[PDB]
Design an enzyme around this catalytic site. Structure first.
Site, mmCIF file in Angstrom:
data_model
loop_
_atom_site.group_PDB
_atom_site.id
_atom_site.type_symbol
_atom_site.label_atom_id
_atom_site.label_comp_id
_atom_site.label_asym_id
_atom_site.label_seq_id
_atom_site.Cartn_x
_atom_site.Cartn_y
_atom_site.Cartn_z
ATOM 1 N N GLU A 2 36.672 45.973 36.609
ATOM 2 C CA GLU A 2 35.821 45.210 35.694
ATOM 3 C C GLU A 2 36.514 45.223 34.335
ATOM 4 O OE1 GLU A 2 31.843 46.623 35.469
ATOM 5 O OE2 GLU A 2 31.157 45.020 34.136
ATOM 6 N N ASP A 3 37.351 44.204 34.104
ATOM 7 C CA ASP A 3 38.219 44.082 32.929
ATOM 8 C C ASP A 3 39.073 45.333 32.746
ATOM 9 O OD1 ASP A 3 37.292 41.518 32.385
ATOM 10 O OD2 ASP A 3 35.678 42.262 31.095
ATOM 11 N N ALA A 4 39.694 45.762 33.834
ATOM 12 C CA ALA A 4 40.496 46.980 33.859
ATOM 13 C C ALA A 4 41.942 46.574 34.110
ATOM 14 C CB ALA A 4 39.983 47.946 34.922
#
Ligand SMILES: [Mg+2]
Ligand SMILES: [Zn+2]
Ligand SMILES: [Zn+2]
Ligand SMILES: [Zn+2]
Lengths: 43, 243, 67, 350, 45, 335, 102, 39, 48, 49
Positions: free
Chosen positions: D18-20
């Site tokens: 997750e937006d990593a």
């Protein structure tokens, strides 16, 4: 055996803050889509 | 939680338990605490452990199963058409529980013309690793969407897709591992079944052997969303232009 | 500022790639791309520095009050 | 206000949830996203209204040994050098004031400057830094103003925010050595890998055009457009990409890192302008021990500046009441905070 | 000591212990400090 | 499976090599050391000083990934790390400038040195083969001359654009013995490090070390050590007529050609093209021309940083993989 | 020299007589993981051998070689690791005997 | 100020590391006081 | 498990009263020192 | 604005329902040893499991 063992275990174990669990449960769903479409003029 | 000592000073917890924290990994700080006396440490770990708290109390569904990459990669593993080589199944079965525990390789789904294991048997090996683990379960459920069986058929398995799932003796025989079969949904997931059947420890172990599986395989399979992926065809264009 | 000695993603050296580019743009003019094609650029992540990168160190060395 | 980098949109190694993001060692080692954090520390030395002046003299040599860990980087002038380092304890600027001038006596011929006690300001910091520009000057009221700024060259570590210019944020998850990231026929290993899940629910398709426009801009040479409602279109862009010999959609076949065989689905990759934010993990890490407490409640301070303190309660202590924890909620609000010894009585027990 | 570089014409002047700090013929007020003559050491990482 | 993959417009097919015994009912032939020696002949295209296009045969993707993985990182190189300074009054701070001094390649062959330990500090770190020291000093004034140069600062200032050739070499004792038969230079002399102005000064002394590519980025001797699966065109049902003109304008002007008149489209060679697959768009070639990417070939394209020839690089990679396996072979097993 | 650092048999994963053993090898990575899996896997006695690192920041690698009742999984890795050296010796010999031309 | 247990009248030093900064003595090591209280 | 890094794990202690079972382990963490991670910062004996 | 109202709503919902135990008589009881419901939910079972 399995149904009765899952029913006697599902009885609420005493000594639990049921009011605290319920108050965290009611205060949780803060999504509130609020679809104001259509029974006219009801909140 | 328990402790773990790693470099690179940012925190790490996992990604399966990201749903109750509602974390987004966008510069989101989130602090930790430690107990002090020997009373409150066991009071924390026996009453507020992650193995105990698989359920939100508002309705009793499992809330900590996995997250987006894990579900969408297990869907690619066990779709219907992911027949693995024996070397590929060998590496993929070793790369879930890396060297801590062993497996018994079943007979494959297809005999003498080339031996190919179906991906659903591969997910079946994820639940029951050996005969030394009493993890026999039973389940029958639905992959969150299905076209109904248009003919006069009693089961909902005779459709255009897999649809209705069925588990007999810790073995899936039809279906994928999408939402509301894996978690974050209704009360009929696989992990909820492992929980209610054999306690919290095996329920946690199945998730922690699925995580190391899918996180390490989906980086090897490949998945992207290009401009060809979101290209409207000429048929959709000429249908929109008249509608 | 100053062009790096080697590019980020690949490892091909970017020395004798900037002054030989501005020298080729001033004298013996080429449009934009045949300059890099004649200078010897093949991989297009080695081409995102000479095409890119406004020169800041020539504007930073302007500020010296009679040094 | 950033840095350009090619980027392969794929789901890689499970650190892409997750937006990593996931960066590249030996690509970040070549000067990718290197930071310079500059903080100044001005301590104007003032002369008091008691006929005295604050001498900034120092340099305790202590038997010719390139002096001690407190006054190592100070030199024989009082003010710190330029280029020397400091790591949590060296005095880099001196400030010595007297205490007989804290009151207001008469300006007698008795010794007013009789003691020059040391009360400097010291670089309290987790990482070592350097001094590049120290200056002493004058202010309005004829007093020696001194400004010194310190800079450290922060390598972008793990935990640092990296966001695209197009509208998706990101924090790095792990750093990959050189070659575990999938290359191509030319062999260009990408720098960062973004989340494919970050595109649908955030609903971004212009970044998916931005990779193609950046690929054609770095290919044909010309810096390309892409302003609002106009700019360089995609129809001629796919023609340029297929005329050079690449794919018409930005896709490419790639070869896996840990096993060497091909990728089953195609992966598209091209340059995105990647800017780095002011959320270095050194500027956001926090700690707490049995340290300073307030004069008013004997509880720790706020924020990070003084020492720090992370409160829990008013919605947070109720969570362990909802669990039913009794001794943890007692200990972490009584014993770990403040154990006091109020004496009581039975008859009028005040 | 040869330090205290000016900020307008960059002259090497050495002010005394009492100066009420002033520059040289440039006619300036502030002044920087020259780099030390020591040996700074670190790796190229 | 005929050692070939399928290329469809959305995914590929048969990625796994699957050439082991135990795959369909028999021994899909086992190792057989005589057979692997008999069935291994390679094809070298060319060897430049910074280019090699030598191919390979009859091995899977796994050990080819091993030979491109050890070639890019796990083979040693030579570059300076410890950069000692002397009153650097430039506008570039010393960390970035020492990074530029370190990361540039240094043309000197290895095996003249050994490895260093993390203990035994500075008076004992550099024991008789550790240091290729490169001493530098540069400063300028206003050049006494009469040019005009009102826009370009070329003839106005002396040596304002310092290069990699300004980095000299200081030999001491036995260091001049390896310099006589092997004079040391950098890789490319026209590499810009810094830009200076009069009144500013750069002088320093950088120490070198022998390192492996896992530590820093400057210890990689190869810029790109990748390979390529060779594209095999498997065209059937020939396309003679006027469709061959569109078939030539769709593909690159390389790999495919036409005989004369109204003949079919043959294939020139193999090592020419990538996969553009624009033919999988139109409703003429979508079910008529079928291409693919064969295994068994593994087209290499390596280039040096300037340190050594790529025929030394591949040989050193094979030898260090053999040594890395031998060190694990001779290790005793202890629970 | 008694240099026991690389290989280590897991006492909590093997069976009684043998036939399966987790080998925790240190200071090695994917440079030889798939290069050794492919050689041990095409042994007709070895039926299940796969490698997986526990965590990338640690320099660890676990491989679990399962076999049938013929040979010991301890001694199966010996023959499946000598043959990779034989591979590299054949490739080095053919590359040396080919590079002498041109 | 000279209040201690093992020694008497020694010097003192508030800590720089661990964000703890308690006023401690020398050569045996005793905090000899409470936690620090600052405003 | 939450991974607690040693830059904030060496400043975050937990008291352990020795109970004739972990005497060797606590002696190891005393003799090891508070600079490295398996160590101990402070100590309080039986006397006041 | 909806989260800004919902946080205060969930906070002021809490203090009226914070102290509510469940003793071993299978009853739910208040702070003053009162009683509000003789068995929880009519059955007395755990709504979680
Ligand atoms: Mg957030
Ligand atoms: Zn590049
Ligand atoms: Zn001046
Ligand atoms: Zn003492």
């Amino acid at each position: 055996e399995i149904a009765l063992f899952k029913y006697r275990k599902a009885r609420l174990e005493p000594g639990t803050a049921i009011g605290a669990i319920g108050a965290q449960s009611i205060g949780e769903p803060g999504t509130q889509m609020t679809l104001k479409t259509f029974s006219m003029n009801v909140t | 939680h328990y402790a773990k000592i790693r470099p690179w000073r940012t925190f790490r917890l996992n990604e399966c338990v990201c749903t109750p924290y509602n974390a987004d990994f966008d510069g989101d700080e989130m602090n930790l605490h430690v107990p002090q006396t020997e009373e409150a440490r066991a009071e924390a770990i026996n009453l507020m452990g992650v193995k105990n708290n698989l359920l939100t109390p508002k309705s009793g569904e499992p809330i900590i199963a996995a997250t987006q990459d894990f579900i969408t990669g297990s869907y690619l593993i066990s779709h219907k058409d992911s027949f693995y080589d024996r070397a590929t199944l060998t590496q993929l079965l070793s790369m879930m529980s890396d060297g801590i525990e062993h497996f018994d390789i079943p007979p494959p789904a297809i005999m003498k013309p080339y031996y190919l294991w179906t991906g659903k048997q591969v997910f079946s090996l994820l639940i029951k690793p050996n005969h030394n683990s009493p993890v026999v379960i039973n389940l029958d459920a639905k992959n969150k969407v299905f076209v109904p069986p248009k003919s006069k058929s009693l089961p909902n398995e005779m459709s255009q897709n897999d649809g209705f799932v069925i588990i007999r003796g810790s073995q899936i025989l039809s279906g994928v591992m999408d939402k509301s079969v894996l978690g974050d949904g209704k009360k009929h997931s696989v992990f909820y079944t492992i929980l209610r059947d054999y306690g919290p420890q095996e329920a946690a172990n199945a998730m922690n052997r699925m995580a190391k599986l899918c996180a390490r395989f989906l980086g090897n399979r490949g998945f992207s969303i290009g401009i060809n992926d979101v290209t409207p065809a000429d048929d959709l264009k000429q249908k929109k232009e008249e509608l | 500022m100053i062009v790096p000695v080697r590019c980020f993603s690949c490892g091909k050296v970017v020395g004798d790639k900037w002054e030989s580019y501005l020298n080729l743009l001033q004298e013996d003019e080429l449009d934009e791309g045949t300059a890099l094609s004649r200078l010897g650029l093949k991989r297009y992540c080695c081409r995102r520095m000479i095409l890119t990168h406004v020169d800041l160190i020539e504007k930073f060395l302007r500020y010296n009050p009679l040094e | 206000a950033g840095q350009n980098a090619t980027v392969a949109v794929m789901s890689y190694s499970g650190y892409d949830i997750e937006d990593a993001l996931v960066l590249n060692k030996s690509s970040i080692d070549r000067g990718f996203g290197r930071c310079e954090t500059r903080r100044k520390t001005t301590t104007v030395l003032k002369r008091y209204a008691n006929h005295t002046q604050d001498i900034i003299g120092g340099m305790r040599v202590d038997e010719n040994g390139d002096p001690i860990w407190q006054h190592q980087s100070l030199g024989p002038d009082g003010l710190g050098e330029v280029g020397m380092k400091v790591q949590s304890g060296q005095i880099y600027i001196n400030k010595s004031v007297p205490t007989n001038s804290a009151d207001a006596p008469n300006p007698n011929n008795v010794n007013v400057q009789t003691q020059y006690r040391e009360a400097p300001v010291i670089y309290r910091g987790p990482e070592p830094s350097h001094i590049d520009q120290v200056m002493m000057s004058v202010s309005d009221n004829d007093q020696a103003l001194i400004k010194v700024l310190l800079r450290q060259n922060r390598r972008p570590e793990l935990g640092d925010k990296f966001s695209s210019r197009h509208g998706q944020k990101g924090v790095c998850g792990i750093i990959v050595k050189q070659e575990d990231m999938p290359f191509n026929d030319q062999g260009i290993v990408p720098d960062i890998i973004m989340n494919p899940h970050g595109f649908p629910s955030r609903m971004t398709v212009g970044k998916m055009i931005e990779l193609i426009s950046g690929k054609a801009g770095v290919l044909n040479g010309t810096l390309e457009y892409g302003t609002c409602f106009g700019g360089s279109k995609l129809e001629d862009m796919s023609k340029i990409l297929v005329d050079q010999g690449f794919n018409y959609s930005g896709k490419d076949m790639l070869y896996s890192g840990i096993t060497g065989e091909c990728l089953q689905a195609y992966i598209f990759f091209g340059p995105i302008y990647y800017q780095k934010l002011k959320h270095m993990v050194l500027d956001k890490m926090h700690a707490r021990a049995r340290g300073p407490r307030a004069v008013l409640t004997r509880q720790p301070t706020e924020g990070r500046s003084r020492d720090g303190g992370l409160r829990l309660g008013e919605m947070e202590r109720d969570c362990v009441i909802a669990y039913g924890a009794s001794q943890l909620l007692l200990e972490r609000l009584m014993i770990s905070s403040d154990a006091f010894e109020v004496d009581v009585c039975d008859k009028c027990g005040l | 000591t040869l330090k205290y570089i000016c900020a307008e014409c960059s002259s090497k002047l050495s002010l005394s212990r009492t100066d009420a700090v002033r520059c040289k013929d440039c006619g300036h007020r502030i002044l920087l400090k020259a780099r030390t003559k020591r040996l700074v050491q670190f790796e190229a990482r | 499976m005929s050692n070939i993959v399928g290329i469809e417009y959305n995914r590929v097919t048969n990625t796994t090599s699957t050439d082991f015994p135990g795959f369909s009912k028999d021994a899909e032939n086992e190792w057989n050391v005589e057979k692997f020696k008999k069935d291994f002949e390679v094809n070298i295209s060319s060897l430049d000083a910074r280019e090699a296009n030598f191919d390979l045969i009859n091995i899977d993707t796994s050990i080819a990934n091993a030979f491109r993985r050890i070639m890019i990182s796990e083979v040693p190189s030579v570059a300076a790390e410890y950069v000692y300074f002397f009153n650097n009054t430039s506008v570039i701070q010393d960390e970035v400038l020492a990074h530029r001094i370190g990361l540039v390649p240094l043309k000197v062959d290895p095996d003249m040195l050994t490895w260093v330990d993390s203990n035994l500090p500075d008076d004992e770190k550099f024991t008789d083969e550790n240091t290729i020291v490169l001493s530098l000093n540069v400063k300028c004034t206003r050049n006494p001359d009469a040019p005009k140069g009102s826009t370009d600062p070329k003839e106005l200032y002396n040596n304002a654009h310092v290069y990699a050739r300004d980095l000299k070499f200081e030999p001491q004792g036995r260091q001049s013995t390896t310099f006589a038969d092997c004079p040391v230079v950098p890789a490319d002399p026209d590499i810009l490090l810094a830009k200076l102005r009069p009144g500013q000064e750069i002088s320093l002394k950088a120490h070198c070390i022998l390192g492996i590519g896992g530590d820093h980025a400057k210890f990689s001797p190869v810029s790109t050590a990748s390979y390529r699966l060779l594209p095999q065109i498997n065209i059937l049902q020939p396309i003679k007529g006027e469709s061959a003109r569109r078939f030539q304008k769709c593909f690159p002007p390389g790999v495919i050609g036409i005989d004369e008149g109204s003949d079919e489209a043959y294939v020139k060679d193999a090592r020419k093209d990538t996969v553009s697959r624009e033919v999988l768009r139109y409703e003429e070639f979508a079910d008529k021309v079928k291409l693919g990417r064969v295994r068994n070939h593994f087209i290499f394209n390596v280039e040096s940083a300037g340190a050594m020839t790529p025929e030394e690089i591949f040989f050193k990679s094979v030898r260090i993989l053999k040594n890395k396996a031998e060190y694990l072979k001779n290790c005793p097993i202890t629970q | 020299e008694p240099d026991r650092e690389k290989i280590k048999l897991l006492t909590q994963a093997t069976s009684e007589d043998g036939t399966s053993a987790s080998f925790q090898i240190v200071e090695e990575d994917h440079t030889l993981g798939n290069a050794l899996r492919y050689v041990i896997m095409k042994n007709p006695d070895v039926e299940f051998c796969g490698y997986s690192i526990p965590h990338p920041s640690e320099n660890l690698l676990n491989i679990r070689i399962q076999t049938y009742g013929e040979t010991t999984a301890v001694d199966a890795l010996q023959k499946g690791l000598k043959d990779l050296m034989d591979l590299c010796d054949v490739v080095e010999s053919k590359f040396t005997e080919k590079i002498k031309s041109m | 100020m000279p209040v201690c247990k093992n020694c008497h009248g020694t010097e003192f030093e508030r800590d720089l590391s661990n964000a703890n900064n308690d006023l401690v003595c020398k050569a045996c090591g005793v905090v000899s006081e409470d936690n620090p209280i600052v405003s | 498990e939450v991974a607690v890094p040693d830059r904030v794990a060496k400043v975050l202690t937990y008291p352990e009263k020795v109970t004739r079972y972990n005497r060797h382990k606590l002696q190891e963490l005393i003799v090891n020192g508070p600079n490295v991670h398996p160590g101990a910062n402070y100590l309080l004996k039986r006397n006041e | 604005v909806k989260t800004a109202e919902t946080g205060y709503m969930s906070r002021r919902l809490m203090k009226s329902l914070e102290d509510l135990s469940c003793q071993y008589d299978n009853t739910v009881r208040t702070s003053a040893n009162g009683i509000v419901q003789f068995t929880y939910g009519g059955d007395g079972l755990d709504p979680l499991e």
